[PDB]
């Protein structure tokens, strides 16, 4: 077996492995569109003749707390042939891509995990949380304080692409976890909005000046509407879109994959009607360069200036000073006051997990509880961390 | 219909209404034990001859952030006869008890809600969050950093009451949401630990010096262990108890009703194995006296001294100054900078809900986003808010 | 918002609202075929630019007891945008169409209800009952008295359209609830008989000289045959068709949506094998002109001549004389002996509901129990009321 | 009604009856391919004008113990119209085909039964056993003794037809129950390997020099892989293919329809992981000529030479001498020592059922238990009996 | 931790561990009855004070092919505390008991496995197969050849103990897998025949001179009868009991845990009605003394005298000569012709698994296929191997 960047001849072998590895495999036409986001030298294959392993990264733009946009390597299309398990192919492919990603100057890498047990050992920590809410809309009544209660319009998605793009572009710059969505991914999204024979039903859009929702009736449960995407840049837009969705009088239930701080439950007289039916890790982060990443993000202005020494396991030791919402992170050989594996740092980085929660599991070690409270407060995000789209 | 404090003659009528209203009705013997927590004048009934409505409160001790214990009126045993719906009996009973509770000098009242849509209009806000985790323990592997890995012992609950009481007493003083558990409730708890013919199976305990877990196999799902209660006063105890529970090799799944900040997922190599299968409002709070409650709790030392004017709808207007983890809350007629209904204040009070989340739903109105960030940070609890026991 | 008859430009907006409102939306091609049954001025839309509401009626021919055929306005394609709920659009559209229907000279209007709680307040009463029977055909044995036991032929529906049309035309003239089925609806029916990729399986027909049955295997339950339509003009045809359906030896169960008086159960040695698995209101009637409707239908010859005074709430007061199977219904200011809302009259009109049953619910008020027995007997239909097809 | 060989004009009527009788009806194009295996005079129809009944046989080659290949008449496409049940059409069609099959010189006939209760009375006995194994591959660990542990390759079925054909041809000559698979059935098999809109997903192949496996993800259960076919000519190939299938890391379960003696369970440390989820009769045999069939197959060399008298009910009486793995079977009027119906002989013939098991049900009568042990041992197959493909 | 034989003081600790380890724990009274089958020094415990591990064996009598009864050590009541997993307690307890069992002169040990993956590494091989048949008795029709068709009587189990004991005693001496059932186990069995509040329903018996069946209606499925035990010493008794069970006209289905060679399916016109709904390893055997065990059992008289050299991994090497249904097994240092682990020998020993099946998984290695056929034939049992009762 040998690991190398793939030639044009390798791509049919990669699509076969893809088709056999991913049940949601988007097919060669869609794969060729996503491929435009893969830089030169962004892919590796392992051949035995035939492709027995592959992995690549895409050039992405990730919003982190403080409305800072980082260049991000988005790992994807990772597969090992069922014939070549337990031969260290994944470890070999991840090592080679991480080397290329670091040499290319990316401060962070990111992925969506097919399983929860794989990516921790390669330095990836879960950094966003997916939260499915299911609303029994037959009982849903909006609170007297709820904004609104004719600003929203029912429209065909393909006829209002420009308006969706503009709303999304405002949303992603404003929200930690936001990703730039390139033209090819808008092409792919609005192609999925069409009904398929023996497949998904037709998608409809609810369009507001400052938000949109894309939804479709479930294939088999004809009383369930699934919201594929709701992007709202104001509270008024968010409420107005939910009033319109609760107006889907032929539906019994409306489902959406959102974030833990979604205010929908508080818009209703009965907060319990917005049931949490599913929770899962969303985006995973590997901090490639600790000082670059720590200095790039904004921090909470509320916590007072403090200094400490952070040691990342096989990742370096730093004098970390945080004050006025900014961090300075410099090399030191001074005694560490905080230790953690690289994956734990990825989990803290966007504000989704509390340092004190990770400390309680001993994933993060300090002998100073005041330092723990200060890390918690400083790494907290004012804007709740959200998940943009799966890649 | 007339509302009055119940005579000894009313109690058989109250037990009949109880039996018809609560499917989990604990029966007259248990009810008579709980009754010892109801003060003189703690109960109201509405008669038509027969009891058509009832409500009472118990004297409770609630731990709030800063390890401060408040006297708390715990509303319970609230029922209206199916024959007397929509005659304002609940509104009449809640008004009379709230008057008695306020005149008695309780700064807060609390309850567990049978439905989510009832108690908001009487000034109760959900203040704790129940989070059910289900672990597929056949795949569960503890992380290398996980504490431990013979400190825990498998024991009969009834033989180690004193040790459970001592651990719980340490736990409840330390944790916001903690309740003092009186002797009668320990009597009731250890009586539920026995197997019942056609009922629950036998309960077992896992006992550590600094924690315990009570669990039983599910009646019908014989591969499910349900943890009724896990109290751990150290991280070492929490991990050691979970190592023992993952050691229940005849079980496929272990379930527990915990809090959102439970560190269990981070103790495992695969965080996804600890699945969130259910979420619900736990304890509801009504702030009876805004200045007494706001001044009693501790606040985050991290946020800098700040002053504002809080107006509670039909609850008064206050100059609120927070600094050095303490609040001063005094009458003012100065212009309000923050407005909210009383229920919203109950929801912020223990740190379970963010002011900025409630603002996004317009349940909390200010024109200052800096003030919002300061409220969020100040009302945050360093110790995660937990739910003690249902009443 | 404005209500007006739709221009050709409005129809794409109407199809979008249709697609978003009706999960069974037949698509623009089918909708354009049904549209040929909508008279000039038969449709209304409410615009905000975009279509936020619509409703129309079709010209139909309804058979009522006595084999009398009434011109009937069939309301259909009624939708309000999820963005424009609770603004009285439905009430405004129903008022305008009812005005047009009454001015056009229709004695009755009719509809199929998407929900049971909407149409009562606009004067529509449920007038037919759908009764689903499921037969476990593996145990089905025909009684010795059962007619028959090679008159039926298994055929391709598209090759015997003329024979189906002729049988249906005889059936609909003979049966209360019968509707004339125009050529476009035969086009649509025999187009649904074809298998669809990821859709329904192929339909087969059982053809007798005096009856037919159309059936198909269920998409997902491959041991269930669903009879979409069985029309039999003689008892011999009905039995012969059921012998052939019980002969579907690869099926475990045969299902059909029929009427409560279907004799199938009595054709078998075990009447219990024909299980009632579902019941629902079928056709709803609004009597537009009380005297025209009451005088048009035939009445039971068995009841002796009787006279009374019927008052319809906001519908007039009439001297009603019934004798020799005919009614005379004339204006009066004499004291009412019977009162009911207009919807109740629609429910009595085809013989599906007993006056004494509606009296027991106080939907129909009289102080004379003899009058009640006479109404029951007179309004009864000798031919059981059936449902023709959904519109 | 009349029974006759079908003209070219009869075939559209036969396809209509097929479509109405077989939910898995392969359609006219596929039926026309299978039709190439039906000899002249291989089919009968019963007409009333229209086709109310049909049955045919195909020319097949069946491997029986001793690696002997018999010409075999494969009955198929048997249907009676639901309109013509209980008129003896099946009995009339089976009698006519059996006459033709016997006159043509076939020693055995065979079929796959749509139900278990039909074919016994026409002399067919179930002769192979289908055994579905479902493996929870997440727990599957191969035993230290298991062969292997990169010989298998993941490939597209349509690109390796020649290799599949060659492996199958070696397999079918070696295994009792093996059938020659003609070119048209390879055409049909590799056409089913393609994904269908609203139908089955894409098939993949695992290819070894001495075995192959064809599998696809289940349409609705996306964590289930179904192996449609695994053919292995060596133990090494069988183990290597199962290592590759257990490597389908995105699947929770792998299912296969195999035979009772499949060694898969013994390849794993936990034999229980290979769960038997389904069992059913596979191939049914009717021995057309008792002496020809008994003399054609090989017998166990282990049992010593023995002689007996076998009487088949309405099938003749024979002096049966078995020695050195060969039988001689000659006419006799000597007293019978063994009696059985013809169907019982079909059940013994390939070694799937023990004579002593059928004796215990009195399907096989002797007064000599030594004779029973000798029949059991002699009729046993060294190579386990398997099922080739459904027809 | 220390391993030692338990004192009377240890038994409450053992019952606590039992209650926490076995959901079907029979309780202290039943455990005390089973305890009478445990010899002096038959039990081991591991203490830390408290019991963290236990294992014992009972003195049993096992019937093996040739109607030979072996003294057998029945391992049971094996548990490790959930607090003491992965400390080698099981390995330590099994080593100590195996030493005692071997020194005591038992030629074999046996157990029922709670999981399939544990006992192979301690030399236990699965030796019997449990086969659940479920009959849809509404379609069940007995074949014309079926024996019988008033010999069976419906009776109360507790009134016919003597008759059950006598039938069972005849059965167990005759059948490989048979166990002597001592008086205490008859006490326990007929105590389980009584209905329990919130537990199993009442058991009934069907009694024949040469067989009995004990059955009860399922707790929750009231159309399912479960046969707990059917013992028949003649084919006539077996058929007569099944005629009576198919006569349970209020039941839809009859279920029984039987063996793979149960003739029930062949008693019916439709063999498919007896569905295999479950299969699992029953009794596991560890051959403690290879020569004693191999020489004790009878072998098939059909296979000719043959000699070979068997090597058991860490179990010795033997010259094995089999002829006239007897084996001689003597020490040798001659080259091995057959090798296998000890567990594989346990799996062959009662005739449930074929040597050629285990060879195909490479659990059994030889370079002689003739030797394999001879082992298969010789180790085969004329009487099908059955499972007596769980211990
Ligand atoms: N569609 C997704 N959820 N991820 N797809 C990512 C992808 C990236 C690169 C290639 Cl070449 C193909 C696919
Ligand atoms: N057992 C509970 N979950 N709540 N029970 C509270 C209660 C309080 C007072 C009386 Cl008199 C009876 C019951
Ligand atoms: N197919 C139905 N069940 N009802 N469809 C009625 C309809 C009537 C008019 C138009 Cl323009 C479109 C559809
Ligand atoms: N595809 C099958 N499982 N059996 N199909 C057999 C067949 C045989 C002859 C004709 Cl003409 C059509 C079909
Ligand atoms: N009831 C069973 N299935 N096995 N029980 C075996 C047992 C053996 C010894 C003791 Cl001390 C307790 C129980």
UniProtKB/Swiss-Prot annotation, chains A, B, C, D, E:
GO cellular component: bacterial extracellular vesicle; cytosol; host cell cytoplasmic vesicle; host extracellular space
UniProt binding sites for acetyl-CoA: 78-80, 86-91, 114-115
Top EC category: transferase
Further details from the record: Increased expression of eis due to point mutations in the promoter region of eis is responsible for resistance to the second-line injectable drug kanamycin in a number of M.tuberculosis clinical isolates, through acetylation of its amino groups, which leads to inactivation of the drug.
Domain notes: The Eis monomer consists of three regions that are assembled into a heart-shaped molecule. This shape is formed by an unusual fusion of two general control non-derepressible 5 (GCN5)-related N-acetyltransferase (GNAT) regions and a C-terminal region. The N-acetyltransferase domain of Eis is responsible for its modulation of ROS generation and pro-inflammatory responses in macrophages.
Job description of the protein: Effector that is released into the host cell and affects host immune responses; it negatively modulates inflammation, macrophage autophagy, and cell death through redox-dependent signaling. Acts as an acetyltransferase. Acetylates 'Lys-55' of dual-specificity protein phosphatase 16 (DUSP16)/mitogen-activated protein kinase phosphatase-7 (MKP-7), a JNK-specific phosphatase; this leads to the inhibition of JNK-dependent autophagy, phagosome maturation, and ROS (reactive oxygen species) generation for enhanced intracellular survival of M.tuberculosis. Can also acetylate multiple amine groups of many aminoglycoside (AG) antibiotics, leading to their inactivation, and thus contributes to drug resistance. Is also able to acetylate and deactivate the cyclic peptide antibiotic capreomycin, but not the other anti-tuberculous drugs isoniazid and pyrazinamide. Acetylates kanamycin (KAN) more efficiently than amikacin (AMK), even though Eis seems to bind AMK with higher affinity. Does not acetylate and inactivate streptomycin, apramycin and spectinomycin.
Major location category of this protein: secreted
Ranges of residues in domain N-acetyltransferase: 1-147
Means of activity regulation: Is potently inhibited by several small-molecules that share an isothiazole S,S-dioxide heterocyclic core. Some of these inhibitors, when used in combination with KAN against resistant M.tuberculosis, efficiently overcome Eis-mediated KAN resistance by restoring the antibacterial activity of KAN. Some of these compounds also inhibit in vitro acetylation of DNA-binding protein HupB.
Protein name per its UniProtKB record: N-acetyltransferase Eis
Phenotypic consequence of gene deletion: No significant difference in terms of intracellular survival in U-397 macrophages and in an in vivo mouse aerosol model of infection. A strain lacking this gene induces more TNF-alpha but less IL-10 production in primary human monocytes than wild-type. Macrophages infected with a M.tuberculosis eis-deletion mutant display markedly increased accumulation of massive autophagic vacuoles and formation of autophagosomes in vitro and in vivo.
Molecular function GO terms recorded: aminoglycoside N-acetyltransferase activity; identical protein binding; N-acetyltransferase activity; protein-lysine-acetyltransferase activity
HAMAP family: Eis
Gene: eis
UniProt organism field: Mycobacterium tuberculosis (strain ATCC 25618 / H37Rv)
